[PDB]
Amino acid sequence: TTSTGESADPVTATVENYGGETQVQRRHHTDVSFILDRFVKVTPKDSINVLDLMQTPSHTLVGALLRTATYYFADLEVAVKHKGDLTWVPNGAPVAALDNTTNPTAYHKAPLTRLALPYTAPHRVLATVYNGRPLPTSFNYGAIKATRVTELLYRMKRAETYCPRPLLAVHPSAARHKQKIVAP
Amino acid sequence: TTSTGESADPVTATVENYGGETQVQRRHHTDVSFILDRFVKVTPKDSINVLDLMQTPSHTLVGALLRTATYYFADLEVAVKHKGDLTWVPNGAPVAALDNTTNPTAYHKAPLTRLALPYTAPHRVLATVYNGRPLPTSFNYGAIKATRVTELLYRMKRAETYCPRPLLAVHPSAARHKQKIVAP
Amino acid sequence: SGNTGSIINNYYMQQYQNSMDTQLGNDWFSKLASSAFSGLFGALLA
Amino acid sequence: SGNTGSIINNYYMQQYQNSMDTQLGNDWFSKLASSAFSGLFGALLA
Amino acid sequence: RILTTRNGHTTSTTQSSVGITHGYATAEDFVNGPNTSGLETRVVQAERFFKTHLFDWVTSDPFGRYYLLELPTDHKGVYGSLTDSYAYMRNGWDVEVTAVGNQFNGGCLLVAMVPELCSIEQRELFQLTLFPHQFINPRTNMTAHIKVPFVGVNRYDQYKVHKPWTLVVMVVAPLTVNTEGAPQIKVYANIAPTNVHVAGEFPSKE
Amino acid sequence: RILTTRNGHTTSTTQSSVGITHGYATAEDFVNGPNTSGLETRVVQAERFFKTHLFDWVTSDPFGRYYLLELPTDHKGVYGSLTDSYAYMRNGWDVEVTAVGNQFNGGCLLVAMVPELCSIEQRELFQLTLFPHQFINPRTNMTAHIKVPFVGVNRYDQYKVHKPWTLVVMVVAPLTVNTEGAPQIKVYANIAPTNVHVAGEFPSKE
Amino acid sequence: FTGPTDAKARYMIAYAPPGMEPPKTPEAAAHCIHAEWDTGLNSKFTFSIPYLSAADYAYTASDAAETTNVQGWVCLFQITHGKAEGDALVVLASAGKDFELRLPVDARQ
Secondary structure, three states: OEEOHHHOOOOOOOHHHOOOOOOOOOOHHHOHHHHOOOEEEOOOOOOOEEEOHHHOOOOOHHHHHHHOEEEEEEEEEEEEEEEOOEEEEOOOOOHHHHHOOOOOEEOOOOOOEEEEEOOOOOOOOEEOOOOOOOOOOOOOOEEEEOOEEEEEEEEEEEEEEEEEOOOOOOOOOOOOOOEOEOOO | OOOOHHHOOOOOOOHHHOOOOOOOOOOHHHOHHHHOOOEEEOOOOOOOEEEOHHHOOOOOHHHHHHHOEEEEEEEEEEEEEEEOOEEEEOOOOEHHHHHOOOOOEEOOOOOOEEEEEOOOOOOOOEEOOOOOOOOOOOOOOEEEEOOEEEEEEEEEEEEEEEEEOOOOOOOOOOOOOOOOOOOO | OOOOOOOOOOOEOHHHHOOOOOOOOOOHHHHHHOOOOOOOOOOOOO | OOOOOEOOOOOOOHHHHOOOOOOOOOOHHHHHHOOOOOOOOOEOOO | OOEEEEEOOEEEEEOOOOOOEEOOOOOOOOOOOOOOOOOOEEOOOOOOOEEEEEEEEOOOOOOOOEEEEEEOOOOOOHHHHHHHHEEEEEEEEEEEEEEOOOOOOEEEEEEEEEEOOOOOOOHHHHHHHHOOEEEEOOOOOOEEEEEEOOOOOOOOEOOOOOOOEEEEEEEEEEEEOOOOOOOOEEEEEEEEEEEEEEEEEOOOOO | OOEEEEEOOEEEEEOOOOOOEEOOOOOOOOOOOOOOOOOOEEOOOOOOOEEEEEEEEOOOOOOOOEEEEEEOOOOOOHHHHHHHHEEEEEEEEEEEEEEOOOOOOEEEEEEEEEEOOOOOOOHHHHHHHHOOEEEEOOOOOOEEEEEEOOOOOOOOEOOOOOOOEEEEEEEEEEEEOOOOOOOOEEEEEEEEEEEEEEEEEOOOOO | OOOOOOOEEEEEEEEEOOOOOOOOOHHHHOOOEEEEEEOOOOOEEOOOOOOOOOOOOOOOOOEOOOOOOOOOEEEEEEEEEEOOOOOOOOOOOOOOOOOOOOOOOOOOO
C-alpha cells in the first residue's frame, strides 16, 4: 500500500493485502473515562493540601495518561486518611476559610474518609500545560485541611481529554527492556 | 449383560436385569460449579503472594477436585487477613507495580478483607498440568502485597473443567480404611 | 449456577461482579454417559 | 460511562453526586481514524 | 468386522477391529481465531499416515509396563518440514496401534491418548481409563484405533516448546503364550495428523 | 503509470511501467491430461516472487552483450523443494526485470523469454524480437514485465533434464552516462512461477 | 522517503515470527510476510504488522527472564538505491484498525 506520506492523512493498511483477515477488536480497557477512573497516590502535606491533579507523579498510570492531553475535564473523588476534622473549600476561596466548620467538614471516622467533589473551577476546561513551568492559580479543585493528613488519593470521574500530547516509555539500554515478570 | 469390553463404549447395566427397579438420583452436590465454590486455605508468604490456584494443597477438597481436570476456567474470590494496605495487580504486570496505591488497594478494615477478582489471564483457559513440573508464568490471577498477610483464601466462581484426570484416594493397609466417625 | 443464595438482584452490574464472556464464529461427558447401553445383548428367557 | 458497577439507581440525585453540565448555542479523533485509507493505490495483479 | 481408513492417498485395512473411539469431541473446534488475524492456512498434503515402532511386548513385562510417545514426533515427511517453516500450528490426531500375535496368545493392552502427560503416578494408572482408549485383547482384536482433536490453552500451538498429546500404552495383563501363541508380540503405530493449519512463515537458513 | 503485481502474499510496485506483455497465450492450456491419470495436484503456496542478480550493465558492453538465465533455477524456497519431491511438474512464468539508473542515462536493453534456447547465433540476435519481449529504455521505464505459459513437447516436464524457458537480456544500445546519469546500472530480476502442478511423489532419503 | 527528486530507492519490510533467528539478508527474508515499495510521486508507504500469536493477547512489558522476544522481529531492508547515498527515510508508527489494549496497571515508569 503506497501513498504520499507528506499528506499526513491517516493511512492504515491491513493484513488482507497479502491475504490475511482482520480480526475483532475490543478496546474497552483503553477508553479514556474507563482507564482514568481509579485512585492514585499523592504525597500529602501535613495540614493544607490544595487539590490539584498535577501533583500526581508523572510516571504513575493515572499521572502519565493525564499529562498526555492539553485540556482535560473531570469531577474528583478523594480518599483521605487524617487526624481531626477534614475541612474542604471550593475553588478560589480564601485560605482563611479552611478554619470554619461551616464549610464542608468530615468528622473523623476510621479507617479513612471518602468524598465526592464537583468540578469547581471557573474555566470551562482545565489544562495540563499552560503557555504564559507554573500553572495559573485558578487551576485547582480547592483545598483540604486537617490536623494532619496521612494519605491522599485522587479519583477522576467523567474524564474528558482534548488535544493529545507525547507519551513516553522507558528507553532501554539493550535491544529490549527486560523486567522480571510474575511467575510461579 | 455381555458386550465387547475392548470397545470402550460405556455400558451401564441396571438392576432391572435380575428384577430390581432403578431409583431417582439427585446429583446437585457433585456439580462442578457447585462443589468448587467455597474457600480453601493457602499458606501465605509475608509480603508478595502471587495468586495461583495450584498453591492449594493437593489433598484438600478444592485442591484435589481442581487437579482432576487438565483445563479449567473460573473467576476468583479472595479473603485476606493482613496488616496495612492490600494492593492487587492484574496478570502480567511488573512486580514494581505493587507499590502504587493507584492499583486496586483495600485499606485495612477488621477483621479481614474480601475481594472479587476477574479472570485476568491472556490464555482462553488455564491448565493444571502443562507439558513443556513447572507451569508457565502466564498462569496466574496476579499478585497481592501487604505489610504482612496472616491468612489467604481462594474461592472459585463459575468454574468450568475439561479433560478429566486421575483422582486418588488413600490406600488402606488393611482390607478397609477405618476412620473415627463423629458420634455422640 | 454455582453456590449463590440471593433471591434479589446483585447490587453491581453483571459487567463488574464478573468477567464478561465473548463468543466466536455437561456438553461432552453427559452426552457420553447418556448413550450407555442398558440392554441385554443376547436373547432373554423367562 | 466510566468504571461503575451499580445495577441499581444511585441513592443521591444526579444533581448532587455530579456537577451538572450546561449547553451553549470519540468526536474528532475517532472520526479521524475511521477515515483511514485501507485500499491499494495502484492496480492489483493476481 | 472389516474397516478401511483412508487419509490422503494412504490407507489401512483391518479385518479384526472393534471400531473407532472419538476422544473428547466428534469434530474440531473453531479454526480461525482472533489471534492469527486470519493469516492461517490449511495444509492438505500433510494429512497421511506414518509408521513407528513402540516396543516388544513379552511375558516378562508385569502389570504397569507403560510406554510414552509424545506427539508430534520427529517426522521426515511433509509434516516434519512444516514444523520448521511455520511458527504456529494445530492439528488433530488419528492414531492406530497394532500388536499381532495369534488368537492363542493371552494378556491385554490399554492404549490411550493422554493430553498433557507429565510424570503420571503408579497408582494413577488404575484410573488411566479416564482418557480415550481401547483395549487390545489378542483373543479378539489386533488393532486399536483412536481419533482425538487438538487441545491446548492456545488456539494455535508451537510444537517446539509444547507437545499437547502423548500416546501411552500400558500392560493390564501380562502375555501368555500357552504354547500355541506367538512367543512375543511387537507393537507398532500408524498415525496421521488431521486438520493441520499453519501460520507465520519463518525465514530460511540462507 | 503505476502498476501493482501481487503473487501469493508477495507484491511489487512500479511507478514507471509500460505494462505487461503476454507471451504466446493469455491463459494456460489444459492442465489435466491423459498421461497423469488425474493424479496431478496444484500447489498454491509455491506461487510467489523470488529475486536474483543478472549482471552489471556498463558503458564498455557493446551491442550483442547477452545474458542467459535458464528457468527453473536453483530455488531454496518451497518451489525448490517441490522439484525434489515430485517427478513431474509444469508451470508458467511471470518475469520482471529491473535496471535502475536515472533518467539521464542512455542506451537500451531487450529482455525476452526464449523457449528452448540453445546456442543462438550472433546474427540471429537481430531477429530476437520474435520472442516475447519489452525494451528497457532508461529514458522511460526502469522495469520490464513478461508473462508466458508452460510450453513443451510434453504436458508435464521433468525439470532435472529439461529447462523449457530461458530468460535472455541483450544490449541493443550501449550505456551513456552523459555526466548526469548513473555510472553503471545493475540488473535484477523478480520472478514468480504460475499455475504450478505436480505429480509422482518420490520416496525420501531415509 | 525524504531524499531529493533525482534519487530513487527500493525497500523491503518484513515480519519475522518467533522461534527462529530473524533474517540477515533480503533473500532470506523474502520467505516471510513482507512488502516492497519504491520511491516516486507518493513519498509515503504504510505497512500493517499483523498480530500473530498463540494466545489471544500478549504482554506489553518485556519480562526479564525472556531472552528472545516472544512476538518476533520486524526487519527493514534496502534492496537498492539510485544515487541515494546520504538520503534519509523517516519512519512513523501508529495503532491500526483492530489494535486493542486492556487491563490498566500503574507500573511506575
